């Protein structure tokens, strides 16, 4: 009845011993990490406008981050995925735009075809929100601090003056044909090569930018927007993550 | 501490110790007599 199999004595008679835990494991990394105790929500940077504090009278530039169909699609767990995180989805999209596979995924998770999906990593299993629920601006409290991630404005192929604040050469006094240049880019032979990461002209902007400890000036579920003190990376209609500030409480 | 190659005990109250692969001379009376071998 049983299948034919031979087993080595060396592998059978080996005394059982568990492996020690390693730093470059997922679980150790998770333990190390500095993470927020609560989920976040995806937003769109609609624009920017003044916020007048009515008690003091102080004016503050505030960016208006709109919150539309923001929904916990699913979430990830340490036993399956190696970490705790809430996959949030923002907005509504047409059928036409979304891939068949993506549509099927959304149907399975029981949400509308979504405009932008993103994870929100958390410390514990307690931080996970039940899936399918709708996240509104009232999630955050007025006066609380939040970290803000988004892709910055694209600046194109930039020079070393704009990239790195290089002084450049003089305007007059003989200076020929190199007014905005980086000057020397290395050393004669010793190295015999431009060493890695030598600040040179290149593409700038259109990279992710976390902005830490920004104050939530105002929250209102009526207009579907979170007011946030100061600037946020990227152009208008750019997607903006928002989670509680790890540094500030 | 006088960090030096030569490390002799000065007074009777000085005592030599061997720690961390270095000869230390501590002293119970005079604190100036503290020495270390390199």
């Amino acid at each position: 009845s049983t299948r034919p199999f031979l087993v080595a004595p060396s592998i059978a008679n080996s005394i059982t011993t568990e492996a020690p835990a390693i730093n470059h494991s997922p679980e150790l990394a998770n333990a190390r990490k500095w993470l927020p105790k609560r989920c976040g929500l995806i937003t769109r940077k609609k624009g920017m406008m003044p916020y007048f504090d009515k008690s003091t009278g102080e004016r503050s530039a505030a960016t208006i981050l709109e919150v539309n169909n923001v929904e916990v699609i699913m979430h990830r767990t340490s036993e399956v995925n190696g970490y705790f995180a809430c996959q949030v989805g923002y907005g509504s999209r047409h059928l036409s735009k979304v891939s068949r596979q993506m549509l099927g995924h959304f149907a399975s998770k029981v949400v509308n075809p979504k405009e932008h999906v993103a994870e929100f990593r958390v410390k514990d299993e307690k931080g996970l929100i039940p899936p399918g629920t709708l996240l509104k601006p009232s999630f955050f409290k007025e006066g609380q601090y939040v970290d803000v991630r988004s892709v910055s404005k694209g600046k194109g192929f930039t020079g070393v003056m704009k990239r790195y604040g290089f002084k450049g050469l003089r305007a007059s006094h003989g200076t020929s044909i190199m007014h905005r240049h980086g000057g020397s880019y290395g050393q004669n032979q010793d190295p015999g090569r431009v060493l890695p990461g030598r600040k040179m002209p290149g593409h700038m902007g259109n990279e992710h930018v976390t902005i830490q400890n920004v104050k939530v000036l105002k929250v209102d579920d009526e207009n579907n927007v979170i007011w946030v003190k100061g600037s946020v990376a990227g152009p208008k209609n750019s997607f903006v993550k928002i989670q509680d500030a790890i540094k500030k409480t | 501490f006088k960090v030096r190659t030569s490390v002799k005990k000065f007074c009777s109250d000085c005592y030599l110790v061997r720690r961390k692969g270095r000869v230390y001379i501590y002293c119970k009376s005079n604190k100036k007599h503290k020495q270390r071998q390199g």
Binding site: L6, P9, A12, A19, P20, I22, N23, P196 | -
Partner: protein
């Protein structure tokens, strides 16, 4: 005349277990022993032009012997190319990062011949800090050895 026949068995890649808990060799000597196996010098059919070396599964690698104070002194180096980026890690630190198996692998790599087959040979080495491993089922075995092993242990191994 000697060469003529069925050569398939000669060039067969066997799988060699080594329970490091049982083995009494120090790290470097063990690595050297492994290297030969990995190359295929042990087998008489060997030729330098042909890779014909066996698999080596190392297990219970946490109990590997290291003499002197090498565990807290011996430094493993690394360098990208950009100056001021020399990464020097002590043996214990390396172990903490990855394991004792990583350490063994490095030794074995250094033992091996420096050419296009080296990487392949290194890959064939399968090291494990503790006991449990997937290759348990594929170590070379014989029917005459089966009486030594108790009845239910074999079944448990098969299940695993």
């Amino acid at each position: 005349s000697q060469k003529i026949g069925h050569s398939g068995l000669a060039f067969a890649r066997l799988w060699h277990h080594v329970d490091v808990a049982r083995d009494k060799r120090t790290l470097g000597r063990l690595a050297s022993a492994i290297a030969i196996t990995l190359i295929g010098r042990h087998k008489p059919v060997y030729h330098p032009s042909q890779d014909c070396g066996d698999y080596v599964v190392v297990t219970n690698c946490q109990k590997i012997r290291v003499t002197g104070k090498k565990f807290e002194q011996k430094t493993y180096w690394s360098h990208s190319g950009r100056p001021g980026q020399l990464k020097l890690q002590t043996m214990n630190k390396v172990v903490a990062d990855k394991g004792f198996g990583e350490i063994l692998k490095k030794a074995v790599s250094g033992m091996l011949p420096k050419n296009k087959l080296r990487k392949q040979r290194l890959d064939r080495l399968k090291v494990f800090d503790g006991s449990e491993n997937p290759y348990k089922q594929n170590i070379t075995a014989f029917a005459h050895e089966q009486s030594s092993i108790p009845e239910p242990l074999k079944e448990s191994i098969f299940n695993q």
